[PDB]
Design a protein around this ligand. Structure first.
Ligand SMILES: CCCCCCCCCCCCCCCCC[C@@H](O)O[C@H](CO[C@H](O)CCCCCCCCCCCCCCC)COP(=O)(O)OCC[N+](C)(C)C
Ligand SMILES: CCCCCCCCCCCCCCCCC[C@@H](O)O[C@H](CO[C@H](O)CCCCCCCCCCCCCCC)COP(=O)(O)OCC[N+](C)(C)C
Ligand SMILES: CCCCCCCC/C=C\CCCCCCCC(=O)OC[C@H](COP(=O)(O)OCCN)OC(=O)CCCCCCC/C=C\CCCCCCCC
Ligand SMILES: CCCCCCCC/C=C\CCCCCCCC(=O)OC[C@H](COP(=O)(O)OCCN)OC(=O)CCCCCCC/C=C\CCCCCCCC
Ligand SMILES: CCCCCCCC/C=C\CCCCCCCC(=O)O[C@H](COC(=O)CCCCCCC/C=C/CCCCCCCC)COP(=O)(O)OCCN
Ligand SMILES: CCCCCCCC/C=C\CCCCCCCC(=O)O[C@H](COC(=O)CCCCCCC/C=C/CCCCCCCC)COP(=O)(O)OCCN
Ligand code: SF4
Lengths: 59, 156, 70, 303, 98, 129, 99, 83
């Protein structure tokens, strides 16, 4: 069993072409990436306070 | 007297400034570089100590040798060390850099990076954990804090 | 958390607070409690020079009202 | 008390650019699920002082064969221009009230490239010379569209005075009248200061860094004044100062956000970006903004 | 004619003499030409502003632009010469002779 | 008097021209030309030509001498003649310069044609072959 | 006078800061031990110069909008911008903007 | 007709910046000749007094020239106020 990763064909009707042009001229995916980074900013960091805190170990 | 008090306080200030901002350039030779990048990861966050990530050779305070130094590579490491400004420190990370380690009896491996450059801190392990390298960096900070230059200049 | 970034930002803001504010206060101090006169176009400059001449103290900001008409 | 005003304009700017490094580090760390510096100083505040003290006590690597004259001259010109560009800005009263403040800003920005040219030339390295040539080409290419967008926007203001920009935006912001020019101006300002995604490139190094960060803060303040018009009531200018500083801080943090969010272009990719997407649209919108006030009988007063 | 006009005319003459000296480095020839242009612009601006000849205020800009165009032209030519010899040395231009 | 500030500026202009006309190490000649251009722009600004002085400082220095340096790096008695009246509620030089689009249509046409022809000329000359 | 004093202060501050930066680490004793000429860079520089000249021509536009000859001024401004666009188009089509 | 529409549809794809630029420039060229407010702009420019209005020497033959600013004779700016 195998999968195709990049075998899609964009639709050439007027609405989809207009959507792609709006993405180009208004940078929608760039704001999407900005928003994901912003959401990542507002969560707790994963940093521990060494040497007062230590990483987990095992026997 | 006040003459030695002034130089003592100036030493304290300069040492605090030097150790509170250590800019390392890392020789990611081998697998110990992976533990360096894990010490730079969110969990340990070297940057939170003032230790920035991947400084340039012309503006680096400390050199981290993390990997096996081969005979083909020794001149490049020595040249990069010579290009570094002073004061400059070297940290030897892992068995390969400390003494050759698993490849000590090899025809193409330098038996320890201290045959090429002087070393300030030796971090043992194969590889040392990110916590171990952080401990070595903090020990280098303490070593810098201990040092005294204006006092040596004053009493000489 | 994220609010730990606020202190430094605050300091930065305070620094950016100083210049403009300072200018304003200085413009109040060197102009008799009023805004510094804007003089473009060489007619406003003529008005300022006339005010300086008629002030009697060589200061344009010393305004003379009807009390000086006698 | 003019010297006091000059010093109170210069020193706080240097402090702001000193702590902008801390702000950038903390912001990037928290966007990367970590922290920034939080060990030196109570909240990492003493980090810039330690950085400066360490930099100023470190041995300087003079090339020992290059032109010492230009090696010393380049940081002087860079920092002098960076500090000079701040004087015409009205917050809300400018330190120096120029008739043609915008043109003076543009001239200083154009001057800012000699520092890059001289530093690359005095590096005494062919690779660094190539990098400097690429940087200068990018700089000039983007200041072209900077100037064109600037004149197109100012056609609605009536003059080159920055103080009149407050009067123009008394009721509404300039962002609403022309948002496309604003987006292009923002990208061009990113490319002007060599910031990501356009970041293709001891003492003097620190001074170059100070010049670049002062240029960043100045450019964001210029954007805030040009496109986000705060309201200025003459009997309490501190309100305008507060609003303007908040907007400038928001724009600088947006710069940090953009740096943390995207990969960087290639040289040919950003060259093509400018010369084939910004310039045609910039020319078209310049024609549109020339025509619009005449078409709608809305020509700004001053002449 | 005050001293400022004399100084600018003398600067133009110095730039012309430097252009005519031709030690080497055709780039220096272009630089001397453009210094001559700068002196011309400066003193023409002084003359027009002194006499309050309003409609003539456009003349300097025009001149500037045209002269700058020539510089581009000259620069291009310089590059061509270098592409044949590797350097912009004046003495390399001796194939054609009287 | 500020010891004839206009005369001092003109004198520095003359020394800058003398320095860069010796043609030493064309990079240094460009440095001298930059200093002289700054001094001349200062002369114009102090005389009252704010727009023309800023045009010098912007166009000449920031574009033209910058291109010169770029290409180089690739390779190996006053105060008496002044007026008395005022200008009104405008600046006379700005009005005269702005009259280029209303009065100087012919100048605009010829200058634009020359600039387009110059672009074409540069491209053809640099084509090579 | 005010602007000259401000520039003098800026230059003096920068010079003093650079001098102390270069001489503070010089007092303590230490160890103290080509041809290519890419044409496209020159071409982009020349294109920048020409576009800068046309920008210089376009600059007086804010004052040009109060003339009572609005039709002529609008025509001339649009003509200048059209010529700028034509120069850009000619450089684009003749492969002048490539790498 | 069909060729023009097909070319425009193909240009709106893969080349939107050029389409937008040409549309904006074309509108900027065409609209001023069709707007009815441009004459109003010319009149507003004509009504801005930069110079002193020099009075005329009355000779008893100027019924249309006012003798005082408040007099009804002369141009009026009621239209500008209503704008
Ligand atoms: C206005 C004129 C300016 C000219 C230049 C002056 C330079 C700027 C002056 C400001 C200096 C800031 C100093 C602040 C440092 C205090 C840090 C303090 O917390 O350090 C502690 C105390 O250590 C030392 O005692 C501090 C020495 C600092 C300097 C001592 C006095 C110097 C004052 C002299 C100033 C006069 C200057 C004259 C010539 C310029 C130890 O912390 P550390 O070990 O790190 O980290 C351990 C991490 N743990 C705690 C989480 C586990
Ligand atoms: C007549 C025969 C023509 C054929 C010969 C062709 C030779 C070359 C053609 C170029 C010559 C163009 C002649 C235009 C002369 C300009 C003056 C005239 O037209 O009057 C102007 C009228 O202006 C017009 O609008 C000019 C419009 C024409 C320019 C637009 C296009 C020009 C392109 C021509 C060639 C450029 C390169 C090629 C492009 C295709 C003045 O306007 P006005 O305001 O009343 O008066 C100002 C004085 N005031 C202030 C006291 C009132
Ligand atoms: C560095 C920049 C130098 C010039 C900066 C100032 C330019 C300017 O536009 O301001 C001039 C200022 C304000 O002009 P307006 O806005 O029109 O208002 C006046 C009406 N009330 O007025 C002046 O002309 C005074 C200044 C003139 C005398 C000094 C001129 C500067 C001389 C610079 C010499 C140094 C050059 C060295 C080489 C430079 C290489 C980078
Ligand atoms: C926002 C604020 C940030 C602050 C910005 C930076 C401000 C700079 C502040 C300066 C702090 C003082 C710096 C002093 C450290 C100088 C370097 C140093 O460590 O000197 C050591 C050096 C050791 O030499 P040797 O032992 O002989 O070498 C033998 C090996 N070959 O001793 C010296 O030579 C120092 C000379 C005497 C210094 C004492 C006088 C006080 C100086 C105060 C600062 C002066 C400059 C300001
Ligand atoms: C009816 C009359 C109306 C009058 C005319 C009005 C028309 C308006 C409609 C069109 C205008 C839109 C133009 C706005 C700018 C467009 C520029 C553009 O689209 O360029 C992009 C590219 O633009 C970019 O990629 C730039 C991204 C830079 C990275 C940083 C991201 C920035 C986004 C963060 C927010 C930006 C904030 C902007 C406003 C700030 C204000 C202070 C095209 O490039 P490519 O997709 O690669 O394809 C070209 C080859 N065919
Ligand atoms: C008549 C109005 C004039 C004034 C407006 C102009 C303002 C400025 C716009 C022009 C700037 C310069 C344009 C230069 C043109 C060059 C085009 C070109 O060569 O690009 C082609 C491709 O582009 C084309 O196909 C040619 C242009 C396509 C058509 C563009 C728009 C034409 C008109 C459409 C709108 C008409 C009016 C609007 C109608 C709607 C009603 C409002 C090759 O692209 P490459 O990137 O090099 O190769 C691709 C692989 N890397
Ligand atoms: S020191 Fe150990 S872990 Fe590191 S590269 Fe060598 S063998 Fe691998």
């Amino acid at each position: 069993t195998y999968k195709f990763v990049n075998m899609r064909e964009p639709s050439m009707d007027m609405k989809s072409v207009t959507d792609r042009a709006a993405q180009t001229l208004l940078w929608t995916e760039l704001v999407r990436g900005l928003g994901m980074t912003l959401s990542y900013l507002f969560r707790e960091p994963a940093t521990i306070n060494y040497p007062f805190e230590k990483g987990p170990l095992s026997p | 007297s006040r003459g030695e008090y002034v130089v003592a306080k100036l030493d304290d200030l300069v040492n605090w400034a030097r150790r509170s901002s250590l800019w390392p350039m890392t020789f990611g030779l081998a697998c110990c570089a992976v533990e360096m990048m894990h010490m730079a990861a969110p969990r340990y966050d070297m940057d939170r100590f003032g230790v920035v990530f991947r400084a340039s050779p012309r503006q680096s305070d400390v050199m981290i040798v993390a990997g096996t130094l081969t005979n083909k590579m020794a001149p490049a490491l020595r040249k990069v060390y010579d290009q570094m400004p002073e004061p400059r420190y070297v940290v030897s990370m892992g068995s390969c850099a400390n003494g050759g380690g698993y490849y000590h009896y090899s025809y193409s491996v330098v038996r320890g990076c201290d045959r090429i450059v002087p070393v300030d801190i030796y971090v043992p392990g194969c590889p040392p954990t990110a916590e171990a390298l952080l401990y070595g960096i903090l020990q280098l900070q303490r070593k810098i804090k201990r040092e005294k230059r204006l006092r040596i200049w004053y009493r000489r | 958390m994220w609010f730990e970034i606020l202190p430094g930002i605050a300091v930065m803001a305070a620094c950016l607070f100083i210049p403009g504010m300072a200018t304003a206060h200085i413009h109040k101090f060197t102009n008799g409690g009023k805004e510094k006169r804007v003089a473009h176009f060489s007619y406003q400059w003529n008005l300022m020079e006339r005010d300086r001449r008629i002030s009697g103290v060589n200061r344009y900001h010393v305004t003379k009202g009807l009390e000086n008409i006698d | 008390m003019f010297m006091i005003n000059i010093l109170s304009l210069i020193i706080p700017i240097l402090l702001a650019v000193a702590f902008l490094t801390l702000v950038e580090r903390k912001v990037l760390g928290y966007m990367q699920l970590r922290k920034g510096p939080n060990v030196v100083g109570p909240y990492g505040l003493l980090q810039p002082i330690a950085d400066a003290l360490k930099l100023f006590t470190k041995e300087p690597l003079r090339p020992a064969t290059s032109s010492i004259s230009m090696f010393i001259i380049a940081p002087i010109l860079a920092l002098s221009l960076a500090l000079t560009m701040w004087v015409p800005l009205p917050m809300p009263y400018p330190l120096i009230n120029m008739n043609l403040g915008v043109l003076f800003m543009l001239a200083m920005s154009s001057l800012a490239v000699y520092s890059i040219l001289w530093s690359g030339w005095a590096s005494n390295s062919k690779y660094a010379l190539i990098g400097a040539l690429r940087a200068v080409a990018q700089t000039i290419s983007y200041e072209v569209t900077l100037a064109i967008i600037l004149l197109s926007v100012l056609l609605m203001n009536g003059s080159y005075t920055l103080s009149t920009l407050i009067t123009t935006q008394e009721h509404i912001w300039m962002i609403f009248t022309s948002w496309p020019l604003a987006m292009m101006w923002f990208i061009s300002t990113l490319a002007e200061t060599n910031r990501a995604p356009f970041d293709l490139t001891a003492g003097p190094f620190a001074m170059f860094f100070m010049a670049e960060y002062a240029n960043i803060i100045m450019m964001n303040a210029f954007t805030a004044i040009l496109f986000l018009g705060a309201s200025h009531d003459p009997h309490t200018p501190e309100l305008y100062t507060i609003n303007f500083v908040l907007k400038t801080l928001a724009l600088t943090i947006t710069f940090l956000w953009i740096r943390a969010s995207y990969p960087r272009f290639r040289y040919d990719q950003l060259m093509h970006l400018l010369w084939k997407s910004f310039l045609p649209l910039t020319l078209a919108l310049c024609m549109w903004h020339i025509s619009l006030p005449i078409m709608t009988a809305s020509i700004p007063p001053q002449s | 004619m005050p001293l400022v006009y004399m100084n600018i005319i003398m600067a133009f003459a110095i730039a012309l003499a430097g252009l005519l000296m031709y030690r080497s480095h055709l780039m220096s020839s272009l630089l001397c030409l453009e210094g001559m242009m700068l002196s011309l612009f400066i003193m023409s601006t002084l003359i027009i502003l002194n006499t309050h000849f309003t409609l003539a205020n456009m003349m300097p800009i025009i001149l500037l632009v045209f002269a700058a165009c020539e510089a581009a032209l000259g620069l291009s030519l310089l590059v061509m010469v270098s592409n044949t010899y590797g350097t912009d040395y004046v003495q390399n231009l001796n194939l054609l002779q009287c | 008097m500020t010891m004839y500030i206009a005369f001092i500026l003109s004198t520095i202009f003359v020394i800058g021209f003398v320095g860069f006309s010796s043609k030493p190490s064309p990079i240094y000649g460009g440095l001298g030309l930059i200093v002289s251009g700054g001094v001349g722009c200062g002369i114009v600004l102090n005389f009252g030509g704010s727009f023309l002085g800023l045009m010098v400082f912007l166009i000449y220095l920031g574009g033209m001498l910058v291109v010169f340096g770029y290409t180089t790096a690739m390779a190996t008695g006053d105060w008496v003649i002044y007026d008395t009246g005022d200008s009104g509620f405008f600046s006379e030089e700005a009005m005269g310069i702005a009259a280029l689009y209303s009065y100087g249509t012919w100048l605009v046409i010829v200058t634009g044609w020359s600039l387009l022809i110059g672009v074409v000329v540069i491209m053809e000359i640099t084509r090579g072959n | 006078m005010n602007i000259m004093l401000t520039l003098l202060t800026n230059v003096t501050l920068a010079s003093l800061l650079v001098l102390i930066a270069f001489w503070l680490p010089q007092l303590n004793a230490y160890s103290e031990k080509r041809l290519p000429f890419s044409m496209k860079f020159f071409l982009v520089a020349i294109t920048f110069l020409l576009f800068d000249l046309e920008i210089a021509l376009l600059l007086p536009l804010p004052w040009a909008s109060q003339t009572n000859n609005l039709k002529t001024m609008l025509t001339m401004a649009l003509f200048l911008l059209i010529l700028l666009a034509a120069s850009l188009a000619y450089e684009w089509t003749q492969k002048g903007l490539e790498w | 007709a069909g060729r023009i529409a097909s070319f425009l549809k193909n240009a709106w794809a893969k080349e939107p910046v050029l389409v937008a630029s040409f549309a904006i420039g074309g509108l900027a060229i065409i609209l001023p000749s069709l707007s009815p407010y441009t004459n109003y702009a010319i009149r507003i420019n004509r009504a801005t007094p930069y110079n002193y209005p020099v009075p005329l020497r009355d000779d008893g033959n100027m019924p249309d020239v006012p003798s005082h600013p408040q007099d009804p004779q002369g141009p009026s700016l009621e239209w500008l106020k209503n704008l």
